[PDB]
Amino acid sequence: ILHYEKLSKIGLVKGVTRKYKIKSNPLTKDIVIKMIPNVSNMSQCTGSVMENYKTRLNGILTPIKGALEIYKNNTHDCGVCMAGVAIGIATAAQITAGVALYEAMKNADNINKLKSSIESTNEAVVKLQETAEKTVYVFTALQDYINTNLVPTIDKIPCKQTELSLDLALSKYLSDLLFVFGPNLQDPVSNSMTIQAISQAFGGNYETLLRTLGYATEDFDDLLESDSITGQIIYVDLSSYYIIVRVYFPILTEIQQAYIQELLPVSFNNDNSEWISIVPNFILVRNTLISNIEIGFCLITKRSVICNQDYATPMTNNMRECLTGSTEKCPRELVVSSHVPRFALSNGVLFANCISVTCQCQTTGRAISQSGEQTLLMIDNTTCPTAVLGNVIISLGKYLGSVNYNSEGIAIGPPVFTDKVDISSQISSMNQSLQQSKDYIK
Amino acid sequence: ILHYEKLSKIGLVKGVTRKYKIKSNPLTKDIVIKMIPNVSNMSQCTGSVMENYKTRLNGILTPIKGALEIYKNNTHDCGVCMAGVAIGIATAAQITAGVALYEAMKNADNINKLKSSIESTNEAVVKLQETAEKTVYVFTALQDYINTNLVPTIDKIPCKQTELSLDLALSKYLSDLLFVFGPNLQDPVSNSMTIQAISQAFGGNYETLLRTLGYATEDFDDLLESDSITGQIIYVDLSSYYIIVRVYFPILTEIQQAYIQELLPVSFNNDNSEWISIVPNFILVRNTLISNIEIGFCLITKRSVICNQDYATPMTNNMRECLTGSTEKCPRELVVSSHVPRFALSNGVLFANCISVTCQCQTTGRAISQSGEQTLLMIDNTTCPTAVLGNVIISLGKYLGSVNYNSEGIAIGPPVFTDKVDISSQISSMNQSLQQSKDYIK
Amino acid sequence: ILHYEKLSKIGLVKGVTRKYKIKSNPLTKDIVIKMIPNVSNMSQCTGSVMENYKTRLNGILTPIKGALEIYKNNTHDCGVCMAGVAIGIATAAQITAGVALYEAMKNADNINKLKSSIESTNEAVVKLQETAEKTVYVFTALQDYINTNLVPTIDKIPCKQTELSLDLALSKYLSDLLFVFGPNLQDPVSNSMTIQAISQAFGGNYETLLRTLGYATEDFDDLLESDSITGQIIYVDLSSYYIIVRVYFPILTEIQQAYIQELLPVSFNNDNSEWISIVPNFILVRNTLISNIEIGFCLITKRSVICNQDYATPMTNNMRECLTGSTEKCPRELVVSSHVPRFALSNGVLFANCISVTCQCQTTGRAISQSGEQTLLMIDNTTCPTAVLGNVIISLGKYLGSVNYNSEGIAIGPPVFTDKVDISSQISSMNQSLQQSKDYIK
Amino acid sequence: QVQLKQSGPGLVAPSQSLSITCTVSGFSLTSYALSWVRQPPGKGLEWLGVIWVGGVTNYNSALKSRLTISKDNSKSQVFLKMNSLQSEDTARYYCASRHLSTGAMDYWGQGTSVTVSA
Amino acid sequence: DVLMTQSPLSLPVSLGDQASISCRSSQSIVHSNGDTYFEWYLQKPGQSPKLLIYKVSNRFSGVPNRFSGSGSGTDFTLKISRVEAEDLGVYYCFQGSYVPYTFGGGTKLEIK
Ligand SMILES: *[C@@H]1O[C@H](CO)[C@@H](O[C@@H]2O[C@H](CO)[C@@H](O[C@@H]3O[C@H](CO)[C@@H](O)[C@H](O)[C@H]3NC(C)=O)[C@H](O)[C@H]2NC(C)=O)[C@H](O)[C@H]1NC(C)=O
Ligand SMILES: *[C@@H]1O[C@H](CO)[C@@H](O)[C@H](O)[C@H]1NC(C)=O
Ligand SMILES: *[C@@H]1O[C@H](CO)[C@@H](O)[C@H](O)[C@H]1NC(C)=O
Ligand SMILES: *[C@@H]1O[C@H](CO)[C@@H](O)[C@H](O)[C@H]1NC(C)=O
Ligand SMILES: *[C@@H]1O[C@H](CO)[C@@H](O)[C@H](O)[C@H]1NC(C)=O
Ligand SMILES: *[C@@H]1O[C@H](CO)[C@@H](O)[C@H](O)[C@H]1NC(C)=O
Ligand SMILES: *[C@@H]1O[C@H](CO)[C@@H](O)[C@H](O)[C@H]1NC(C)=O
Ligand SMILES: *[C@@H]1O[C@H](CO)[C@@H](O)[C@H](O)[C@H]1NC(C)=O
Ligand SMILES: *[C@@H]1O[C@H](CO)[C@@H](O)[C@H](O)[C@H]1NC(C)=O
Ligand SMILES: *[C@@H]1O[C@H](CO)[C@@H](O)[C@H](O)[C@H]1NC(C)=O
Ligand SMILES: *[C@@H]1O[C@H](CO)[C@@H](O)[C@H](O)[C@H]1NC(C)=O
Ligand SMILES: *[C@@H]1O[C@H](CO)[C@@H](O)[C@H](O)[C@H]1NC(C)=O
C-alpha cells in the first residue's frame, strides 16, 4: 500500500515490479572425482614426483576423512538414529547434513565396489555401467593435459624436462586446489557448498560436470548463478585418492501473494540545495506486510528475484509510515558530488529536477522553469508533448495521477549523515547533550 | 585551514599532499570478437561437439540481443529521438547510453558488410581493411589453442582423444563467460563495463586488445587500474556468433584548487591507557570547503588520487569543527591490541608516545621521559640531534612551529566504541535513558 | 567468567573452546625470479616481440626501483643509521622495513655476482651454487611453456604462428601480472606482502617455491592459509629483468591464559512472536578480561584460532554485563525469515524452541509442549531419554546445571533493528525527541 | 594375456539339468562383466544373460525363467546353470567378457557343444 | 523389445568392390546416460566371433582401416572399402542399450 504520488516528490520514482521465488525440492545424483592422473603410458621416466604428490595429497585429505568419521561412527538405525552424547556439540544444519550423509552412504557402498575399475581409468571423463540401468561418472584431473602434451612429445624432448613439466603441473593443481579444500574447509558435513567451488578439484570446469550429468532445464542459468546447485562430500578414499560427491538439483517455486518493488532515486531541490532521500531501494511486500530484503545475496532478473534462501528482514515503524505517505518522517542527505541522477522516466512520464539541469519544450521552443518552492517537476504531454534534455529528445505520455501535481506541496524530513565515521560522532554528540539535560533535570 | 598543531597532539600526524583528477573526454574505437573458433583444418575429428556448443552459445547470447533490441526499435531521427511511452521505465544513465548506442550504428553497418570475411578468419588476431573508412580488428577465442596444439598432434593421437580435448577446452572457456555474460548482465545498454571484464570473451587477455589498438604511457596504467577504460556492446550476431564492442579512451583532467590531505594515526596516552582518534584519514579540500571522500574506489598514487568518478561525500559540522582546532569534539577509542603504531615521522621531526616505547638520546645516552600530563612528545634536533627507538637510529630535523610544544596541553574528546554490535547496544541504552527522562518531566 | 545458564535461556548455546596463537620469530631465505624467458633455441624467427616486451616490462619495473632507492641512498652504518631529514615522511612499519631492506643488502650483493650465470639459465627451476658462499635458487617466469610447446613445433608450424603464440602468451602473462605489480604497489618497502601475491610473477605457483625452498609440517599449512608467510623485494635489475625476494618463515606461539569461546544462536519465544539475541558470537577471554575480536581476519580450526596479528578490540560495559549474567541488558531482534535455527545440541543436551517445531518423546510417545511463558526448553534424559525432531531421532545425556531449569524465568532486553538504513532513521527519531525535551524544559 | 576356458558334460538327457563352468584368466571378475551367448547349429547368435560386477543378473525374457548364473571371485569362475533342458536347447555356448566402458564383448571363449538327446 | 533388422541377408560381392551392410532398430537405442551401445561382430567359420567396431563409429584395436562404421537414430551402416578374401564370413549387429540385448539377423558375405 505504498503511496507513490507522495514518494515521487521526494525523488523516489517507482521502477519495475518483480516476482519472488526460492529453491526447493532437490534431486540427487552421485559423481566420482579422482585427484590423481594415470601415467602408465609414460611411466618409464616419471622420476619420484608421484610419491611426493601422494604424500602431499594424503596430508591434505586426512582431516576431511577424520571429520566425516565422527558422524558415521555414531549413526545407526533405532528412521535415522543418532547418539547425542558422543557428538557433544552440533547445530541443526549439521545434524540434518549427517542424516543426509547416512542416507547417501547406501549408494556410496554400491559405488565403492568398482574401485578397481576407478583406479584404471585413462580418460578425463568416463562412464562405468554398474548395472543395466545404473551408471557411474568418473572425472580425472590433469588427464587431458598429460594425454595431449606429455605423451606425444616424450621422444622429442629429454624427459628430465618432462619430469619438470609434470611436477609444475601437479604443483599448480595443488596451488589452485588449496584455496577450497584446505584448512578453510572446517566443516565438510554440510550441503551449502556450491558446485563451482567443488569443481576446483576438476580445474574449475563445472560446465563439463553439469552437461555430463545431463541436467537440462529452462531455469538452469538462474539456478546456477544464484548458488542454488550445491554438493556434499560423502566418501574419501586415502588409497586410490578419489572422493564421492552428491549433487543436488532443486527447482524454483514462486511465493504467492508476494512481490518486490523498486524505487529510482532522483535528487530534489530544497532551500537552494540538492538532496537525496535515504530509504531502501528494494521493498518486499508479502501479503499485506512490508519488510526489508537482503537483495545483495540474491540474483536480480528483468522480472524476477531468485534466492536460495528467504532473506526477509524486519523494518522500523517510522520507515513503514514513510512508505505509506508520511513524508515528514523520511530522512534526507545533502549532495556535494557532481555525479548524481537528476531525472528519470516512469510510464512515459518524466520526473526531472529542472533547476540543476536545463529543461526545454521543443513544440513551443521556450524553456521549462522550476520555482524555488517546488522539489521536482512532472512533465507529460498535457503541457509538453516532447522535451529536450541536453542531447536527447523524448516524447512523453500522460500522467494518471492528480491533475494538480505541480501545485501541491508536501512536508520534508530531517537531514542525516550516513558516513561511517560520522555515525560515531553523532552518537557522542547526542549522548553528551543527553547527560546535560539529565543533570539539569536533577 | 586544518590546524595541524593541535591535531598532532591527538596523534594525527600530517602526511603527503596529493592532487585530484577525474577522467573526461573519451575517444572511441570499434573491435570485433568472434566467440567461436575455426575448426576447418580438424573437421575430420570434431564429432558433434560444435552443434552443442552453438546451441549453448545461442541461448547465452539471446537475452543480450533481446535487451539491446528495445532501444533499437524506439530510437530514430526527427538530434537523437526517442519514444518515451514505448520504453516505459528508464534511468538517466540508460537514456544517456541509449543515445550513444544509436550513434555507433553508422559504424556497425560498415563492419557488418564484411560478414563473410569475418567468418573465414583463422588466426587469433587479424586486420580487415578495404578502405581507410573500414579498418577493424577481429579477435577469435581459442584459435591459438587449435592452431598450435590440436592441429600439430592430429595424427599421433587417437581421433577421439582429440575430440574430447576440444570439448573440454570449449567448456572451460564457457565456464568463465557465465561470470560476466551470464544472467548477471541484466543491463547491457550501460557503458560502465570495464575492459578487463569484456576481455573475458577473449580469455582474459586485455593486454593484447589494448596494445593492438593503440599506445601506452604513464597515464595508461593509471587509466587502466582506475577502471576508466570501458566498453559497450553495440551489436550481437546470433548466426555468425560475434559481437561488436566500442572502447572508450578518456583523458585525465585535474581539478583546480583541489587537493587531498592524509593523516597518520598515532596512539597517545591520556590517564593510564592508550587511545586512538576516530577521524577520517583522507580529507578532500576543494576551493574552500572541507568534505569526506569515498577513497575506496580511487587509485592512490604517490603524487595524486585518480578517481574515475566524483566521490565527494558530506561531513558533519562537529567533525568539520574538530579538524579546524576544536580538539574537544574529537572522538577517541581505547587501545586493547598490541599492534597499533606508537610513533611517526613528518618533515624530519618524529612524534612518539614515549610511555609505550623506549625513547632515548643517541648523542648523550640519556633517556627521554614523558610525564602523565603529556599525550605525545615532539623530538627534534634542538632537543637531540640523534634518537634511537630500538633497532633503528635516526637523525632529526628542526620543527617549524611553536617553541613551547611540549609545555602546552589540550582538551580531548569523549570515548567511543565502533564495533558493529556495540552500535546497537549504544542506541538502545540512549533510547531507554531518553524514555526515563520523559517520564519524570511529565 | 560467563554465565552460560542464563545465556542458554536467552538463546546463546555455548560451543567449543579454542586456543589463541599468533605469528612470531621468522627465518629468512632468498630467491631469484627471472621475469623474461630464454628464447635462444627459437630465436631464428621470434620477430620483434621481445623488444616490445622488454619496453613494456621496463616501464612496469621502473617505479619499484625508484621507490626502493629512497631508502637505499639514505641508510648507512653509523647499528642501522638513517637520515630523517632526507626521508621526510614515514611510518614506523616503513622504517622497520627499511632497516630490514638495509640488512638484506649483504646477501643481495653476493647474489648479484652470479648475474652472467643468471641470464644463461634455461630451465624453470635452476639451483645455482658457485661455492658455499652463494647457493641461490632461480625461477624463470615462462620457460616451461617455451621448452614444452614452442621449440618442438618449429618445423611443423609456419613460425609466424609461433610468433603470434609467443606474443599472446607474453601478453597473457603481463595481464595476470598487472593486478599485483602495477600502480597498486605504492609501497614496495613493507614486508606484509604474502607469498601468494608474489607468486604471480611465477604464474601463481607458490607450491613449487615453498616445496623447493624447504619442508612442510603440521603448522606449515595453517601458516600458509593464515597469510603468515610473506616476502619483501630487495633488488630490481632493469638490464637483466629479475628481482630478489626475501621470504620469511615464522612459527606459531600460543598465548597463555587465553581462549576464544563460541556461542550458538537459537531463536526463542516471547509474546506470540520469535526473537534472536544480538550479541557477539566469538568472545576473546585473556587472563581475566573479556573483549571482542575481529575474527574475520583470522583462521578458525577445530581446536585453535590462528592470526598473524593481535585482533582484540574493546567492548562496552553493557555488553560485558550481559555476558556476565544480567540478561535485561541484552538486545534482541525480531524474526521475519523462516530460515533461522530453532534448536541446538550442547554436551548431549538439547535446547529447542518447541513452539515453532514439533518436539515429542520417542520413549512415551507423547508430545513435548511449551507454555507461553517459557522462552526455551532444556531436554535431557531425566525427562525424555530419546526425542524426535522431524526426520532425526537422537538420544540425550544429562544436564549438569540446575534441576529446576524449566520452571524459572528471566528478564528480557529491548528490541533493536540492525539494518543499515534503519540505523539512520533511529538516530533521526532520537535526536528530534531529544530536541523537544530541551525545548520543553526551557 | 587373457584367455577363457569352458567345461561341461556335453551330452544331456531330456528334462535334466545342465551345468557349464567358464574359468577366467588374465583379468579379475571384479573389473569385468561376463555374458553368455549360444548359437544353434543352423541359426544366428542368441543372447542368454549377463552377471554384473556387484552380482546383479539379467536374463533373456523368452527363456521361461529356466536360467540362473552365479560367479566365484575367489576361484575366478563363473557358473551357468540351466534346468528342464529339451531338444530345442542344442547349441554351442560361449562365455564372453563385457567391458565396463564401451560395453563391448571383446574376449570370447572356445565354446562347448551341448546335445540333448536320448 | 528392440527388434533388430539387418539387410541384405546375402551380399554377393567380387574382390575389390565396396560393401555396405545396413542394420535397423524398431526404436531408438540411445541409453539414458547419452551413449549408444552398438557393435559389429565378424564370425569366421569354425571360429568364435570377434569384435570389429565397438561403438557406432569407434574401431577396435587391431582392426584394419578398411572397416568404417556410421549411423544415427535407428539406422546404422557398415562400409567395407575393399573386399578381400579374409573378410568372408557372417556379420552381426548387436545392440546393448536396453534389456534384453538382441543380435542381428546376420549377413553372409559371398564371392560373386
Ligand atoms: C601411448 O600413446 C600413444 C599415442 O596415443 C599410442 O600410440 C599410437 O600410435 C599410433 C601410430 O601413430 C597411432 O595411430 C595413428 O592414429 C591416428 C588417429 O587415429 C591416425 O590419424 C594415424 O594415421 C595413425 N597412424 C598411422 C601410422 O596410421 C595411434 O593413434 C596411437 N594411439 C593408440 C591408442 O594406438 C600408444 O599405443 C600408447 N601406448 C599403449 C601401450 O597403448
Ligand atoms: C571411528 O571408528 C573407527 C573404527 O573403529 C576408528 O578408527 C575411528 O578412530 C573412529 N573415529 C571417531 C571420531 O570416533
Ligand atoms: C499523451 O500520451 C498518451 C499516451 O499515454 C496518449 O494516449 C495521448 O493521446 C497523448 N496526448 C497528446 C495530446 O499527445
Ligand atoms: C539534531 O537536530 C539539531 C536541530 O535541532 C541539529 O542541530 C543537530 O545537528 C542534530 N544532531 C544529530 C546527531 O542529528
Ligand atoms: C591448414 O589450413 C590451411 C588453409 O587455411 C592449409 O593450407 C594447411 O595445409 C592446413 N594445415 C593442416 C595441417 O591441415
Ligand atoms: C523490434 O522490431 C522487430 C522488427 O520490427 C520485432 O521483431 C521485435 O519484436 C521488436 N521488439 C521490440 C521490443 O519492440
Ligand atoms: C637541525 O636540523 C636542521 C634541518 O631542519 C638544520 O638546518 C640544523 O643545522 C640542525 N641543527 C640545529 C642545531 O638546528
Ligand atoms: C554517555 O556518557 C556517559 C557519561 O557522561 C557514559 O557513562 C555513557 O557510557 C555514555 N553513553 C554512550 C552511549 O556514549
Ligand atoms: C638449446 O640450445 C643449446 C645450444 O646449442 C643446445 O645445446 C641444446 O640442445 C638446445 N636444446 C634443445 C632442447 O634443443
Ligand atoms: C640515489 O643516489 C643515486 C646516485 O647518487 C642517484 O642517481 C639517485 O637519483 C638517488 N635517488 C634518490 C631518490 O635520491
Ligand atoms: C543419562 O545420561 C547420563 C550421562 O550424561 C548417564 O550417566 C545416565 O545413565 C543416563 N540416564 C538414562 C536413564 O539414560
Ligand atoms: C525507544 O523506545 C520506545 C519505547 O520504549 C520505542 O517506541 C522506540 O521505537 C524506541 N526507539 C529506538 C530508536 O530504539
Residue numbers in the entry:
A (entry chain G), B (entry chain A), C (entry chain D): 27 to 104, 112 to 475
D (entry chain H): 1 to 82, 82A, 82B, 82C, 83 to 100, 100A, 100B, 101 to 113
E (entry chain L): 1 to 27, 27A, 27B, 27C, 27D, 27E, 28 to 107
What does the report in the manuscript say about this coordinate set?
NiV has two membrane-anchored glycoproteins, the attachment protein (G, also known as RBP (receptor binding protein)) and fusion (F) protein, that mediate receptor binding and entry into host cells. NiV F initially exists as a homo-trimer on the viral surface, where it adopts a prefusion conformation. G/RBP binding to the cellular receptor, ephrin-B2 or -B3, triggers a conformational change in F that facilitates fusion of the viral and cellular membranes as F adopts the highly stable postfusion conformation. Here, we immunize mice with a rationally designed, prefusion-stabilized trimeric form of NiV F and identify ten antibodies that neutralize NiV in an in vitro infection assay.
